[PDB]
Write a protein that binds this ligand. Structure first.
Ligand code: 7Z6
Ligand code: K
Length: 130
């Protein structure tokens, strides 16, 4: 479906989420993935443009003339791979699987990746939990 947006244009309600769903399908089938992110010896395949669109750290890395060519990126080995996995899934779905057992790891990983809206959200859920 579509609607008449704030401008004159026709706007498609599900378009952006459909694009993201299709990018996640590509990721799931390893189609056009162009980088491996390595965390504590676990490898995660992804699309650089999606990483950059969601993360300040990945934005800085891939706009750098030297680093934009890298097909492998190592993160700080103190990073929890589960924390990374949760944020990567978020990037491709808009859904953040936050819970008691993981929220601290997720918040620390989001801070490192410069995902400021996720960091704020984590703060609110920790602050309410106290
Ligand atoms: O009108 C349109 C818009 C459109 C987008 C895409 N792109 C993708 N589709 C899927 N899966 C569904 C699919 C697979 C194979 C054939 N048909 C549909 N996964 C990933 C991507 Cl990137 C494919 C076809 C069409 N047709
Ligand atoms: K670790």
């Amino acid at each position: 479906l579509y609607f008449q947006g704030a401008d004159s244009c026709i706007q498609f309600t599900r378009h952006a989420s459909d694009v993201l769903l299709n990018l996640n399908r590509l990721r799931s089938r390893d189609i056009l993935t162009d980088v491996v992110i390595v965390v504590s010896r676990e490898q995660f395949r992804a699309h650089k443009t999606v990483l950059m669109a969601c993360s300040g750290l990945f934005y800085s890395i891939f706009t750098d003339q030297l680093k934009c060519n890298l097909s492998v990126i190592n993160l700080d080995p103190e990073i929890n791979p589960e924390g990374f996995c949760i944020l990567l899934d978020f990037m491709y779905t808009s859904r953040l699987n936050l819970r008691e057992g993981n929220i601290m790891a997720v918040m620390a990983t989001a801070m490192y990746l410069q995902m400021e809206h996720v960091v704020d959200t984590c703060r609110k859920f920790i602050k309410a939990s106290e």
